[PDB]
Design a protein around this ligand. Structure first.
Ligand code: 47W
Length: 316
């Protein structure tokens, strides 16, 4: 049901077409700020509902310039609504297809932002496990924002040890997938590809792939370090952050740390919320500090975004 949602948000156009989910552009009424709302059906989700809730819980603990920001989670009889940072530039998937393949220097700029996000995810004790172009969006500055739940599919990006149900480290699986991503960025097609799941997979397990003639020697060396079938021989995130290829154009290690972490509550945002809710500062801070990802969380976070853009920190 939509009763609660529409008290807080005005719905605009659909932006996301999917199979288990829809995505709507929306306006957050109190702040006037645009958001994307992902709409998931519980019946559709079935016994994956508890897994989806565990992931939403993980997203609540991520705060990062290259990770899509969560504002609000609203659950009803049949739906879960996720209110997220609107990324207007669309999927990296569509960008790659539109350009054929990216120059080495553009792929480096983009790949550094992927590494930044993923390194941060690992630092917080998590792994993504479904990295692929459909799970990376561009914002209006053409900076990447990591998402999940975007839809042989992601089989082509799955690490061999992942593919055969065996024991694996999430971080190592993410490095493999980042290797596939690197290849597609520079080539515009997959390193392992086929018409059937059995064939695609055999290919993945063998680890052999063509090396198009336009790939630089240094690109080739990095790809072989990321696409090692044996996870033990795969390059670590530590060594990726300051890899020679990664630093070839911009001679600094990847800035993976959050640039915007939550330290203490922003006083200006607390002030505006206090006047609006007719509360004193202490009781308002106490409410916000629960971090329930309810409408209050959403309003706090959206006021914070307003302040970052130099806009009056004000509620309509
Ligand atoms: C980065 O971690 C997560 C991201 C998640 O994203 C959900 C979404 C979205 C989305 C879809 C379409 C859009 C269109 C326009 N603008 C914004 C849009 C946003 C969800 C969950 C996680 C948590 N993560 C999952 C993988 N394992 C580690 C935790």
């Amino acid at each position: 049901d939509y009763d609660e949602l529409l008290k807080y948000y005005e719905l605009h156009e659909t932006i996301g077409t999917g199979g288990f989910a829809k995505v709507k552009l929306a306006c957050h009424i109190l702040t006037g700020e645009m958001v994307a709302i992902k709409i998931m059906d519980k019946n559709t989700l079935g016994s994956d509902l508890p897994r989806i809730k565990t992931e939403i819980e993980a997203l609540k603990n991520l705060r990062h310039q290259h990770i899509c920001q969560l504002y609000h989670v609203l659950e009803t009889a049949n739906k879960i609504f996720m209110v997220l940072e609107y990324c207007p530039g669309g999927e990296l998937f569509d960008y790659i297809i539109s350009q054929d393949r990216l120059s080495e220097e553009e792929t480096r700029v983009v790949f550094r932002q992927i590494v930044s996000a993923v390194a941060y995810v690992h630092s917080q004790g998590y792994a993504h496990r479904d990295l692929k172009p459909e799970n990376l969006l561009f914002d209006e500055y053409h900076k990447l924002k990591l998402i999940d739940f975007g839809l042989c599919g992601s089989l082509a990006y799955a690490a061999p040890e992942l593919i055969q149900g065996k024991s694996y480290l999430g971080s190592e699986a993410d490095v493999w997938s980042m290797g596939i991503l690197l290849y597609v960025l520079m080539c515009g097609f997959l390193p392992f590809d086929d018409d059937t799941a059995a064939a695609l997979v055999a290919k993945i397990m063998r680890g052999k792939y063509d090396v198009p003639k336009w790939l630089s020697p240094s690109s080739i060396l990095l790809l072989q370090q990321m696409l090692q079938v044996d996870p033990k021989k795969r390059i670590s995130m530590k060594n990726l952050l300051n890899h020679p290829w990664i630093m070839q154009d911009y001679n600094y290690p990847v800035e993976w740390q959050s640039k915007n972490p939550f330290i203490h509550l922003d006083d200006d945002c607390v002030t505006e919320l206090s006047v609006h809710h007719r509360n004193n500062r202490q009781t308002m801070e106490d409410l916000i500090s629960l971090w329930q990802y309810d409408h209050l969380t959403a309003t706090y976070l959206l006021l914070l975004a307003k302040k970052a853009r130099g806009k009056p920190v004000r509620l309509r």
